[PDB]
Design a protein around this ligand. Structure first.
Ligand SMILES: Cc1n[nH]c2ccc(-c3cncc(OC[C@@H](N)Cc4c[nH]c5ccccc45)c3)cc12
Lengths: 20, 336
């Protein structure tokens, strides 16, 4: 399930901002 | 509205044209605990000794702001926050600086980040989400009415106060701009097709980020995610989006127009702008004046064990603040 792939993905923590 | 913004625009312009500086000192606050760190600064729970108040102090390492080429951005944030005034924007009580740092002392919102409750709860019911979106929608009309673009909407930057309403934090990318802008900034999952494509963009990017917010809030996950940013950018510009089965018809429609790759067909950036959003079906039950007035029943109130409590914030390694004997970046941060 998409929910599961998200939970198993390395992107569930606080996401850092980017610019450079 | 047009009446409200009018007055609002005039008070902002006065502060904008006359920003206040050096309204406090480090020695007037009691450093108590780190609540968030990052690239060039960290936020600390602080206590004002004269009033006995608690505040969130944002401390910027000047040399770090410079090596990351964020000088103008930092000046933008402070200049903008000392002049804006809305109920869903955290207040900038004091701002000052010393030999090594920049400081922005603001109201402490013990409720914690929307992110934490969201991740912990999994996903919000549509009503509960609409209650939050509405707040973002109004706040975006305010900011935009003033020519400000926010550029960093995302659960991580949304705190929940006692009354259960949103408080937007971090104006590190807020910029006052009439016209196109080209700075690549934001957070991957929330980037607009325009930004990723480096094609000059405008306020329409905040509205796209809103679409991403509403969806994550209501799906438990982002509409575009993968372990690597590039992967994510491929989904973002693809012009394809899938929605859970529980998503209401209206929510899919409101979202189909929010996450519109073609910014000349994206809700918010049309001839009616905001209204195309506020007058949408999914929002048909929203009482905007009520929401702006906080008279609406909150979907959930955060549990706070009192002032100075931080049990709604994760812990973080501490570090002693250090101010060199010499001024580090005088001219660059002169106006701060
Ligand atoms: C907990 C809290 N109460 N009131 C406020 C106001 C503002 C913040 C806040 C603002 N910006 C970023 C935040 O957390 C994430 C990190 N990126 C911390 C950070 C430290 N220095 C800078 C400088 C520029 C952007 C971000 C940061 C929390 C938090 C709180």
């Amino acid at each position: 399930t998409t929910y599961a792939d998200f939970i198993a993905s390395g992107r569930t923590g606080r996401r850092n901002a980017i610019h450079d | 509205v047009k009446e409200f913004l009018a007055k609002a625009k005039e008070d902002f312009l006065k502060k904008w044209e006359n920003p206040a500086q050096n309204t406090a000192h480090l020695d007037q606050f009691e450093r108590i605990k780190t609540l968030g760190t990052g690239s060039f600064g960290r936020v600390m729970l602080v206590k004002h000794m004269e009033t006995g108040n608690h505040y969130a102090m944002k401390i910027l390492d000047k040399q770090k702001v410079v090596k990351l080429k964020q000088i103008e951005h930092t000046l933008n944030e402070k200049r903008i926050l000392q002049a804006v005034n809305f109920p869903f924007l955290v207040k900038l009580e004091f701002s000052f600086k010393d030999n090594s740092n920049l400081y922005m002392v603001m109201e402490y919102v013990p409720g914690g980040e929307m992110f934490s409750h969201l991740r912990r709860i999994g996903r919000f019911s549509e009503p509960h989400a609409r209650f939050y979106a509405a707040q973002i929608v109004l706040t975006f009309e305010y900011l935009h009415s003033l020519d400000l673009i926010y550029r960093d909407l995302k659960p991580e930057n949304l705190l929940i106060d006692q009354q259960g309403y949103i408080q937007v934090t971090d104006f590190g990318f807020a910029k006052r701009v009439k016209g196109r802008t080209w700075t690549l900034c934001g957070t991957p999952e929330y980037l607009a097709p325009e930004i990723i494509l480096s094609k000059g963009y405008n306020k329409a990017v905040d509205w796209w980020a809103l679409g991403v917010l509403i969806y994550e809030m209501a799906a438990g996950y982002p509409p575009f995610f993968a372990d690597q940013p590039i992967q994510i950018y491929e989904k973002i510009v693809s012009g394809k989006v899938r929605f859970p089965s529980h998503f209401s018809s209206d929510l899919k429609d409101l979202l189909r127009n929010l996450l519109q790759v073609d910014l000349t067909k994206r809700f918010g950036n049309l001839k009616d702008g905001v209204n195309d959003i506020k007058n949408h079906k999914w929002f048909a039950t929203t009482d905007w004046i009520a929401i702006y007035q906080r008279k609406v029943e909150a979907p959930f109130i955060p549990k706070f064990k009192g002032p100075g409590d931080t049990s709604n914030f994760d812990d973080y390694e501490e570090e002693e603040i250090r101010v060199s004997i010499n001024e580090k970046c005088g001219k660059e941060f002169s106006e701060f």
